[PDB]
PDB file of C-alpha atoms and ligand atoms in Angstrom:
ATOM      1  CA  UNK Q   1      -3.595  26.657  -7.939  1.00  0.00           C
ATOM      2  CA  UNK Q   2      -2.215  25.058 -10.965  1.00  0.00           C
ATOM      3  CA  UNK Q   3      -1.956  26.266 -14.647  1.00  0.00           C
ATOM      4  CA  UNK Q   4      -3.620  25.537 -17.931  1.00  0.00           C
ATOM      5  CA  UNK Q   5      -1.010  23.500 -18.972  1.00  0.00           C
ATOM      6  CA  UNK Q   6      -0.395  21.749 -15.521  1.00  0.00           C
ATOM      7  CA  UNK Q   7      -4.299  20.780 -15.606  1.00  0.00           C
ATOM      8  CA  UNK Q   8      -4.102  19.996 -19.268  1.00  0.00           C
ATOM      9  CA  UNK Q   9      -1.415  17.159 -18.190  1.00  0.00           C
ATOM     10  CA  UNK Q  10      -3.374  16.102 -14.890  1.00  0.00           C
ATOM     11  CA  UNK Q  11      -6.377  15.502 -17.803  1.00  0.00           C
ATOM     12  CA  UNK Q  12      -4.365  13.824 -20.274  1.00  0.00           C
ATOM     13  CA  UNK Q  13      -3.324  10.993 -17.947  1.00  0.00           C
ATOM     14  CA  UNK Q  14      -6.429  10.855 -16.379  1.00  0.00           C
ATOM     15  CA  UNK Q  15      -7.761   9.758 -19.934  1.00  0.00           C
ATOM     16  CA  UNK Q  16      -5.902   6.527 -19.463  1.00  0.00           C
ATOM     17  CA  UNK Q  17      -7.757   5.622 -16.391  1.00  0.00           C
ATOM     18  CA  UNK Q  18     -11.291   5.465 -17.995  1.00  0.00           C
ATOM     19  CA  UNK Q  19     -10.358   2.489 -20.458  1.00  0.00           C
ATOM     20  CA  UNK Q  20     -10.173   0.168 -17.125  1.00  0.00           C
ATOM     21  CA  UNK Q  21     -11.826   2.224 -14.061  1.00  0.00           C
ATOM     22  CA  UNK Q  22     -11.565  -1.589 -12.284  1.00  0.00           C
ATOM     23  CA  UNK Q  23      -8.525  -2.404 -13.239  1.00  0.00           C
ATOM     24  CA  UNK Q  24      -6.795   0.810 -11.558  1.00  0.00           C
ATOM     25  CA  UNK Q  25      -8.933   0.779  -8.459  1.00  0.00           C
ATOM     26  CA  UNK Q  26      -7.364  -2.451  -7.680  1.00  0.00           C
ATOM     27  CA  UNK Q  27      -4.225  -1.468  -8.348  1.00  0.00           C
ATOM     28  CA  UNK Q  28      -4.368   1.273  -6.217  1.00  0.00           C
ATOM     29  CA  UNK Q  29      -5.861   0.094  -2.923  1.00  0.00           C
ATOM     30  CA  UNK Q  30      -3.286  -3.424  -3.468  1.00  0.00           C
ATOM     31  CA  UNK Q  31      -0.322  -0.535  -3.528  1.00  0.00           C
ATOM     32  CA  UNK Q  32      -1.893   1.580  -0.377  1.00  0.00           C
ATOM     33  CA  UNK Q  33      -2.240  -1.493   1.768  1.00  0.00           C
ATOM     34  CA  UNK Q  34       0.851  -3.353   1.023  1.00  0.00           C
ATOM     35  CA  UNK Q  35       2.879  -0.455   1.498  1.00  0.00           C
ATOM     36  CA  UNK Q  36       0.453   0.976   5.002  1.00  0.00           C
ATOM     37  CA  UNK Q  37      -1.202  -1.831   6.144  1.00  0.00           C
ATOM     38  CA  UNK Q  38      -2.709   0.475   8.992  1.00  0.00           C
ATOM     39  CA  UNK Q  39      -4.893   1.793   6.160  1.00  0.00           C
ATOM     40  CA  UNK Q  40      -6.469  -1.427   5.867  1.00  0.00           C
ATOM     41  CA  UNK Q  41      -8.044  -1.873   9.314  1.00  0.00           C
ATOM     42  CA  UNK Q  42     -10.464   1.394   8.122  1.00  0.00           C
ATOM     43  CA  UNK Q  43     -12.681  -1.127   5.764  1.00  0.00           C
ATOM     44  CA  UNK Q  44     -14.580  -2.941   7.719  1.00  0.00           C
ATOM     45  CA  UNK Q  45     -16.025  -4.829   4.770  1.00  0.00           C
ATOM     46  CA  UNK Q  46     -12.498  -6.389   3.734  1.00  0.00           C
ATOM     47  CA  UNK Q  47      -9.829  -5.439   6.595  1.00  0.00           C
ATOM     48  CA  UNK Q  48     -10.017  -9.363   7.761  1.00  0.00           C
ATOM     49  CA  UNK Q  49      -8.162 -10.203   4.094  1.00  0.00           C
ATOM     50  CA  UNK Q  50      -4.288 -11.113   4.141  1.00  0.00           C
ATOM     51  CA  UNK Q  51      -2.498 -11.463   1.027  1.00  0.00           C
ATOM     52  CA  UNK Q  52      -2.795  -9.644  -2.660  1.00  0.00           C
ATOM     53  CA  UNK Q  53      -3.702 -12.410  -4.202  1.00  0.00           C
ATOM     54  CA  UNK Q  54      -7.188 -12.295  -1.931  1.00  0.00           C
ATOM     55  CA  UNK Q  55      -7.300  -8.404  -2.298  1.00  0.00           C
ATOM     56  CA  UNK Q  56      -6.982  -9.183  -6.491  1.00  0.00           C
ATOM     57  CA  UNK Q  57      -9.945 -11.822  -5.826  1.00  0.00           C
ATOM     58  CA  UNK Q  58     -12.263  -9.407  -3.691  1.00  0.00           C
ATOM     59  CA  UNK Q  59     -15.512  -8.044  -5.635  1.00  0.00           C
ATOM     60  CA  UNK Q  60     -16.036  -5.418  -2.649  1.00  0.00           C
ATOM     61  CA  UNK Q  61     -12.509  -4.188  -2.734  1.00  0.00           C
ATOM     62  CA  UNK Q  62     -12.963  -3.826  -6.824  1.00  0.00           C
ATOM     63  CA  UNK Q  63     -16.150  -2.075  -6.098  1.00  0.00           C
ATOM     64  CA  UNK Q  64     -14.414   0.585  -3.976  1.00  0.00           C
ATOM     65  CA  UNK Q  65     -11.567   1.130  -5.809  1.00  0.00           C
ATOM     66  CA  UNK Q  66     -13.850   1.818  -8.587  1.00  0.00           C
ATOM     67  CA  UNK Q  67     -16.131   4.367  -6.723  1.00  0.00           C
ATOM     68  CA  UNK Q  68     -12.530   6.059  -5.336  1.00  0.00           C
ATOM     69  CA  UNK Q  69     -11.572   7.203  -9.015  1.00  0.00           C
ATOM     70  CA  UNK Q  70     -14.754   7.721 -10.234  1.00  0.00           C
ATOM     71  CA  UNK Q  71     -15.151  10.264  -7.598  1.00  0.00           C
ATOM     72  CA  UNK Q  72     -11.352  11.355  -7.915  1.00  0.00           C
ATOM     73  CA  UNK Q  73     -11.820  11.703 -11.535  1.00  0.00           C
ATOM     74  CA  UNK Q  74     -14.833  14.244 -11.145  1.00  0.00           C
ATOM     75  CA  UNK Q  75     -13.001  16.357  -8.920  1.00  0.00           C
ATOM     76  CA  UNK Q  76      -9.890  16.609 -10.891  1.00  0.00           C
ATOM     77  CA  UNK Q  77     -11.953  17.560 -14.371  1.00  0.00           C
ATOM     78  CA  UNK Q  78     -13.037  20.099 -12.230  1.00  0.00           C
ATOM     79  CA  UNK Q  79      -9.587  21.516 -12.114  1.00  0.00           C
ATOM     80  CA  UNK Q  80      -9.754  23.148  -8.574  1.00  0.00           C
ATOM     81  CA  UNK Q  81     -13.953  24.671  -8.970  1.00  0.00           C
ATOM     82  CA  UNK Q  82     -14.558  21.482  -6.955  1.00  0.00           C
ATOM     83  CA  UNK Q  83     -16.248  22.830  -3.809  1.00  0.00           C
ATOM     84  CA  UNK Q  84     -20.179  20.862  -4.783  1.00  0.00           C
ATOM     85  CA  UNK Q  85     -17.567  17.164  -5.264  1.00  0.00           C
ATOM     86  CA  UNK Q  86     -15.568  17.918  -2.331  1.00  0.00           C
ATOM     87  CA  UNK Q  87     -18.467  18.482   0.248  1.00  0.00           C
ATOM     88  CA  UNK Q  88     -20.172  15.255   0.487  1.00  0.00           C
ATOM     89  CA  UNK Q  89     -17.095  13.727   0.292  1.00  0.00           C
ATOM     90  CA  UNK Q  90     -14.887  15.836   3.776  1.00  0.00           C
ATOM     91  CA  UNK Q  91     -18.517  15.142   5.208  1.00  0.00           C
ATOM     92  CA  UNK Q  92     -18.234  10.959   5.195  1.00  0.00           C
ATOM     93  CA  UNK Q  93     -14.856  10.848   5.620  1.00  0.00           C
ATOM     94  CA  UNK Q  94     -14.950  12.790   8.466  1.00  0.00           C
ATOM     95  CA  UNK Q  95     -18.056  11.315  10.589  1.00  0.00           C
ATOM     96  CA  UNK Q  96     -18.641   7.767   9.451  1.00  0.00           C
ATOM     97  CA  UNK Q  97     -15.085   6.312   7.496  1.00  0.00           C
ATOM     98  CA  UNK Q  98     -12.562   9.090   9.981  1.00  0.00           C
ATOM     99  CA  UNK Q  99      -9.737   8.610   7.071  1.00  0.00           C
ATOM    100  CA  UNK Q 100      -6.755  10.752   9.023  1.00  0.00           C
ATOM    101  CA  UNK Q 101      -5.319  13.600   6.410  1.00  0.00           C
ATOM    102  CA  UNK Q 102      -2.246  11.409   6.602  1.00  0.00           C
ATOM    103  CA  UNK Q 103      -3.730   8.357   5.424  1.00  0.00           C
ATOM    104  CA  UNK Q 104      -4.749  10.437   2.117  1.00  0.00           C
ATOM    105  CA  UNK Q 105      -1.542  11.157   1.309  1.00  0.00           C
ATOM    106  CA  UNK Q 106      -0.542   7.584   1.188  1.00  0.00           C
ATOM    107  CA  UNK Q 107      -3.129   6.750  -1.312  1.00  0.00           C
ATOM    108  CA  UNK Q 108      -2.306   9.897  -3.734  1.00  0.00           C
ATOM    109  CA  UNK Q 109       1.313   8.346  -3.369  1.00  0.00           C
ATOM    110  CA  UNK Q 110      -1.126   5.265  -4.050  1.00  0.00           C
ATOM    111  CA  UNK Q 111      -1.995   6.680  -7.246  1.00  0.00           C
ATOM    112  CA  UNK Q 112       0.835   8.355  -8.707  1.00  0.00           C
ATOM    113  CA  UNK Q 113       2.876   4.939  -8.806  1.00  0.00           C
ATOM    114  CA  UNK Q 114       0.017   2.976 -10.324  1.00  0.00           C
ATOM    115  CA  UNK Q 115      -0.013   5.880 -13.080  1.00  0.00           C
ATOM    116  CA  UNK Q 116       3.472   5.925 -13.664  1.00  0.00           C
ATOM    117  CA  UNK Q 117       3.601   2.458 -13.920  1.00  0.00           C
ATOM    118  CA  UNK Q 118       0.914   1.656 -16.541  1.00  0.00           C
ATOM    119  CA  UNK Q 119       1.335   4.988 -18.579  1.00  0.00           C
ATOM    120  CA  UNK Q 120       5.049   5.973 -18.537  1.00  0.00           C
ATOM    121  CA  UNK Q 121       4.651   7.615 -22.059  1.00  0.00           C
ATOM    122  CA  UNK Q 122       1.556  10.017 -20.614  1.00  0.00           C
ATOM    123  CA  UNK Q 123       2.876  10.567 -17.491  1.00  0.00           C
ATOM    124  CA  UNK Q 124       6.405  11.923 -17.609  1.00  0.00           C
ATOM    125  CA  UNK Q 125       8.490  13.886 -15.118  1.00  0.00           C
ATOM    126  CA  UNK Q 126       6.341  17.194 -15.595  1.00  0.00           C
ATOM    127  CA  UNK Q 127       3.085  15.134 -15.471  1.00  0.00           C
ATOM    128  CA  UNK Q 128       4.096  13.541 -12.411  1.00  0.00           C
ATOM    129  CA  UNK Q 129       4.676  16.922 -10.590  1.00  0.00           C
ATOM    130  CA  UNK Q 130       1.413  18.392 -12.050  1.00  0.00           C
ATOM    131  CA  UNK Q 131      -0.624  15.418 -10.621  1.00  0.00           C
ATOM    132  CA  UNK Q 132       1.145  15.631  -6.902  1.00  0.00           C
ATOM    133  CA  UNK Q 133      -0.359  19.300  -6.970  1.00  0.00           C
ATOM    134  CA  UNK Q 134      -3.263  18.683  -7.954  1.00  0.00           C
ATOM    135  CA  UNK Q 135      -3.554  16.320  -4.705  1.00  0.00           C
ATOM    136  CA  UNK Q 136      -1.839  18.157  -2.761  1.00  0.00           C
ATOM    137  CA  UNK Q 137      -5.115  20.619  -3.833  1.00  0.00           C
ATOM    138  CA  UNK Q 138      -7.416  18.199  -3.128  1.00  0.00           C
ATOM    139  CA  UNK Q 139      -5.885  16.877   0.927  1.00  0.00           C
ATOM    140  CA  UNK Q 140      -5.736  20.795   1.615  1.00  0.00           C
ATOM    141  CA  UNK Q 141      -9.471  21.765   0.764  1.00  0.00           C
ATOM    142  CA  UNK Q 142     -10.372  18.134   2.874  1.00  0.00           C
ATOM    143  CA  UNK Q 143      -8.518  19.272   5.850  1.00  0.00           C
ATOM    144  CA  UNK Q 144     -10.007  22.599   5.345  1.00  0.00           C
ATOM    145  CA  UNK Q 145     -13.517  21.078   5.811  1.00  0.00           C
ATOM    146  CA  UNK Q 146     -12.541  18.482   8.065  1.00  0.00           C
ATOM    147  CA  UNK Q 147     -11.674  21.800  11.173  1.00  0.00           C
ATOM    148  CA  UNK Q 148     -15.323  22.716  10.572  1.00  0.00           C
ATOM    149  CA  UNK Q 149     -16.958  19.201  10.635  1.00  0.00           C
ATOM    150  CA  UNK Q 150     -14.878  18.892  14.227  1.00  0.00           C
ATOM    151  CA  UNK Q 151     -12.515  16.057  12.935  1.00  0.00           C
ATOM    152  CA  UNK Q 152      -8.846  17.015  13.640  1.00  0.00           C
ATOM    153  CA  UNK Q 153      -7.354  15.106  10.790  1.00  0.00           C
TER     154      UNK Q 153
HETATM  155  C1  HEM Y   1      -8.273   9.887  -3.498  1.00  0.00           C
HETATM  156  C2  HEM Y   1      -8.781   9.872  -2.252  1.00  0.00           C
HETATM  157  C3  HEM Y   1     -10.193   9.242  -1.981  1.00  0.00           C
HETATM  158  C4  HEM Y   1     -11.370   9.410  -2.640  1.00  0.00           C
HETATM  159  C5  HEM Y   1     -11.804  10.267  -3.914  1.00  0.00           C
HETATM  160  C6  HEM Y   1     -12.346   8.597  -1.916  1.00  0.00           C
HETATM  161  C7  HEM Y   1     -13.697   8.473  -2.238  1.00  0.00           C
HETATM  162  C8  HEM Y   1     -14.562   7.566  -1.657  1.00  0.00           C
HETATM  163  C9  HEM Y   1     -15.895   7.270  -2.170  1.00  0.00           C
HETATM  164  C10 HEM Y   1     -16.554   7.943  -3.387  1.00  0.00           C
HETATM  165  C11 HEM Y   1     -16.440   6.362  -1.377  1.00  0.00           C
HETATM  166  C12 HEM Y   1     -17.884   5.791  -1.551  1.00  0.00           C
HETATM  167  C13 HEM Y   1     -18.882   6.874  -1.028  1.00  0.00           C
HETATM  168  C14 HEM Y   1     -18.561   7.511   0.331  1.00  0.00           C
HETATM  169  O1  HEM Y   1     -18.614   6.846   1.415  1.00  0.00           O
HETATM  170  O2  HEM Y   1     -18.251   8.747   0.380  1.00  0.00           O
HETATM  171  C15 HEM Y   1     -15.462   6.001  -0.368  1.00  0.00           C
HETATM  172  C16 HEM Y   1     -15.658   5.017   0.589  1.00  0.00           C
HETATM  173  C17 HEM Y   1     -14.772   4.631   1.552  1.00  0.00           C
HETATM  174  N1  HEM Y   1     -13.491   5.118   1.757  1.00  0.00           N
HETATM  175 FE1  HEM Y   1     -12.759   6.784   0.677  1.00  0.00          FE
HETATM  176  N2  HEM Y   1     -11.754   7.942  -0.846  1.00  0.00           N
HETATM  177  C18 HEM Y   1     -10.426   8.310  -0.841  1.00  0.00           C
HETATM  178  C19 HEM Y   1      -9.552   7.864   0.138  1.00  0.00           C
HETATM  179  C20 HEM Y   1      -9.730   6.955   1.192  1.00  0.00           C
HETATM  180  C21 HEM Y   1      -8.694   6.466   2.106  1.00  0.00           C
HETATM  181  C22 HEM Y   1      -7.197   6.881   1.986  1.00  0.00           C
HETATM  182  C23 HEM Y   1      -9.273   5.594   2.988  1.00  0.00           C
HETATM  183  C24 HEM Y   1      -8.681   4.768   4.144  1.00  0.00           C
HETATM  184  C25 HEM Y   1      -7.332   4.656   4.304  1.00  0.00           C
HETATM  185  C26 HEM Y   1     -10.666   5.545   2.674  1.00  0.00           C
HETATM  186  C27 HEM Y   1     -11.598   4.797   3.361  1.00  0.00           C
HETATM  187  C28 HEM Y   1     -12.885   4.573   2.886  1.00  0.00           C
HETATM  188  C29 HEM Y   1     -13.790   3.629   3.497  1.00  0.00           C
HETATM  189  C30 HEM Y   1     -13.519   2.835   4.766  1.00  0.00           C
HETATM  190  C31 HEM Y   1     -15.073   3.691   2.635  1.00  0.00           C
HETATM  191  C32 HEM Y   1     -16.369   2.844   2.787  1.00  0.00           C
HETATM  192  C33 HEM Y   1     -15.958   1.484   2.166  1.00  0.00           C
HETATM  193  C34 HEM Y   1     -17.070   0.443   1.982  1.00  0.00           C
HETATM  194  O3  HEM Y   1     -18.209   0.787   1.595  1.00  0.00           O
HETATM  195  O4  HEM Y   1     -16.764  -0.775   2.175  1.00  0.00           O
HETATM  196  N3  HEM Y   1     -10.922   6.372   1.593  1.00  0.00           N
HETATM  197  N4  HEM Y   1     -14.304   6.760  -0.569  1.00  0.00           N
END
């Protein structure tokens, strides 16, 4: 797992997030699906949209974006003791939404760009690696559920 200090950083930028939730969510999913428009097709509510200036426009994809880091968030304050998050969470993914392990790490890719971008001075080179292990934490425990639940990721 990480350290104090590696957490401490993970925290720290996540601090920047809660200003503007929204704002970030939007950011986020606009980054995954530009770069893997694959990813799309999995939202049924929204996969028929085209361009970023519709994604930028859409309520529902706001609305998700928002419940994605809210539930990120709670997971990383956590700082690995995340097994009560993490459960409902492998379970949906897994039986209704089947997100492949793969498609996960595009979005913490997702994620680390939009951070770097808006908060360069809270998110420097030592930052950036404590963040991609603290996901990489987070898509291993998944997968780990996922075997059980009978989903090969
Ligand atoms: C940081 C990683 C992620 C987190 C914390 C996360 C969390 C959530 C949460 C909290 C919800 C709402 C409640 C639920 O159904 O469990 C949700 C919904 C959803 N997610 Fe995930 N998610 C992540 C990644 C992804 C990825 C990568 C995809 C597809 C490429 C995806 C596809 C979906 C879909 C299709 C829904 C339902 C959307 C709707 O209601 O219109 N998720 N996710």
């Amino acid at each position: 797992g990480l350290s104090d200090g590696e957490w401490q950083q993970v925290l720290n930028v996540w601090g920047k997030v809660e200003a503007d939730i929204a704002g970030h969510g939007q950011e986020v999913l606009i980054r995954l699906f530009t770069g893997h428009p694959e990813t799309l097709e999995k939202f049924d509510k929204f996969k028929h949209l085209k361009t970023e200036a519709e994604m930028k426009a859409s309520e529902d994809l706001k609305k998700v974006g928002t419940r994605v880091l809210t539930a990120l968030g709670g997971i990383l304050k956590k700082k690995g003791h995340h097994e009560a998050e993490l459960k409902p969470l492998a379970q949906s993914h897994a039986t209704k939404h089947k997100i492949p392990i793969k498609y996960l790490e595009f979005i913490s890719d997702a994620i680390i760009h939009v951070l770097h971008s808006k908060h360069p001075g809270d998110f420097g080179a030592d930052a950036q690696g404590a963040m991609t292990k603290a996901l990489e934490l987070f898509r291993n425990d998944i997968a780990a559920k996922y075997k059980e639940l009978g989903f090969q990721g």
